[PDB]
Design a protein around this ligand. Structure first.
Ligand SMILES: [Zn+2]
Length: 145
C-alpha cells in the first residue's frame, strides 16, 4: 500500500555518555553505544583521517581517526571489519568499518563511539550526544541500519 505509519521507537542507542549502572557502585562510560548487528556498515560522522588501527582485550578491534580540527580524535570499538587504512583521508558518511561483537561480554553486539579533545584516551574524552544532535543524519551519520 502507498501510505503507512507506525509508533515504533526511534534511536538505536543503549549506553549514553556519563554514569554507568553496570559498575559495582560508581563509574562512567566514556562514549556512546549503539544497538547494531554484526555486519552493519559504520561511517565517519565528520571529515577525518585514519591515524591508528589495532586490537585489545576490552575493545576487540579498534579504528582510530583524527578530525581535520588538529585537536579532536575518535575511537570505534567492537568492529568486525575495516573499509579504510591508516593514513587514508575520510569524509562525513564514508564507510570506515563494520560492526561486530569482537570485545563484548554482556548486552549483545553494539558500536562503541568515543570522541576525545587534545589527545587520545578516556582522560581526553568529551560528550558526543550533543555533537551527534547537530549531524546531517543525526546518530544515523554513524550507521547504515
Ligand atoms: Zn560502549
Amino acid at each position: 500500500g502507498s501510505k503507512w505509519e507506525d509508533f515504533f521507537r526511534g534511536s538505536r542507542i543503549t549506553e549514553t555518555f556519563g554514569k554507568y549502572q553496570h559498575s559495582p557502585f560508581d563509574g562512567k562510560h566514556y562514549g556512546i553505544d549503539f544497538a547494531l548487528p554484526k555486519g552493519t556498515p559504520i561511517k565517519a560522522p565528520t571529515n577525518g583521517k585514519v591515524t591508528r588501527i589495532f586490537n585489545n582485550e576490552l575493545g576487540g578491534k579498534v579504528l582510530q581517526i583524527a578530525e581535520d580540527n588538529g585537536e579532536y580524535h575518535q575511537w570505534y570499538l567492537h568492529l568486525d571489519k575495516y573499509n579504510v587504512k591508516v593514513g587514508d583521508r575520510v569524509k562525513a558518511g564514508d564507510i570506515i568499518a563494520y560492526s561486530g561483537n569482537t570485545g563484548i561480554q554482556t548486552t549483545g553486539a553494539h558500536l562503541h563511539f568515543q570522541r576525545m579533545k587534545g589527545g587520545v584516551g578516556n582522560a581526553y574524552a568529551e560528550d558526543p550526544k550533543p555533537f551527534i544532535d547537530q549531524l546531517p543524519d543525526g546518530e544515523r551519520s554513524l550507521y547504515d541500519l
